[PDB]
Symmetry: C4
Subunit: 95 residues, 4 copies
């Protein structure tokens, strides 16, 4: 399960790296803003402080969302049940 977590962890990093590079390059975001914009889109928070201004960006976002949401939510799920939950349980009993 650490190896189930690790495949979804890596893939998520590679996916945010993807949006980071595209949005930095094409839409002109500082690298730090691209990553934050990539994370705010794929988790569907969607603040709207950054948003794609070019047609090339609007199209990329359509696909990135569909391809990206499934992964991201899956990592989060793996993260919560397989890492957060056990550590919570372990805190309720002392060693």
């Amino acid at each position: 399960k650490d190896k189930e977590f690790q495949v979804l962890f890596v893939l998520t990093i590679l996916t945010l790296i993807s949006g980071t590079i595209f949005y930095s390059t094409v839409e002109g975001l500082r690298p730090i803003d691209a990553l934050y914009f990539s994370v705010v889109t794929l988790t569907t928070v969607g603040y709207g402080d950054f948003s794609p201004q070019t047609d090339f960006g609007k199209i990329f976002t359509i696909l990135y969302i569909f391809i990206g949401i499934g992964l991201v939510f899956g990592f989060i799920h793996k993260l919560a049940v397989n890492v957060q939950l056990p550590s919570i349980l372990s805190n309720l009993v002392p060693r």
Copy 2:
């Protein structure tokens, strides 16, 4: 399952075509902006860069959301488990 994927794939295309046409016509969006606005609504990202200004648009969006979220999420789900996951598994072993 390719045929389960294909029914949710088609239906999703027909649903985004619906919002594209309505928002282009009534709310005056360029076709490309309507589709992007339709995709950003039904996945609940909700940037807010485009938003309906007319009462006819505000009402349409209420129903489109309820009718549309169930489908869109279902396609994404089908897409992730039945297409993304296997291709991931196949990459871990060489032919």
Copy 3:
């Protein structure tokens, strides 16, 4: 199941009526804008075109979200599997 659908359908109407009345009264929205703002919040689209400006509104929204998301998503779910899906299946075969 029509009666499972009908309890979640009613409850959802009562919940949107709640936000409609509160946001119209306290935050000064036209009734039509309140309902649309209520629907855009509880499905977590969150355009941000309308947003609560008063402290009384910011607090109400905190609770309305927590109390409201569970219902709304549940109706949508019931709506998709128990109404949309069968009608889709029925279209694939002619009477």
Copy 4:
């Protein structure tokens, strides 16, 4: 199950307290605005009326989202099935 509800209830309070304190301090929000901004992010509504302006804030939000969504959604789930649902059922029959 009251004790399953109570662990997710507490943890959620502690998590919103976290964002409240960080966003008040670093991003300069009034305490009431931080909490509302924290609740609007972790449920992925994302109005965008408040949004982090500093790099320290953009980074914190990236992690807070990933760590926070799993909990918050889990509480909401527990809240809906284990508290809202029974009270609904109890209203359909008189004592």
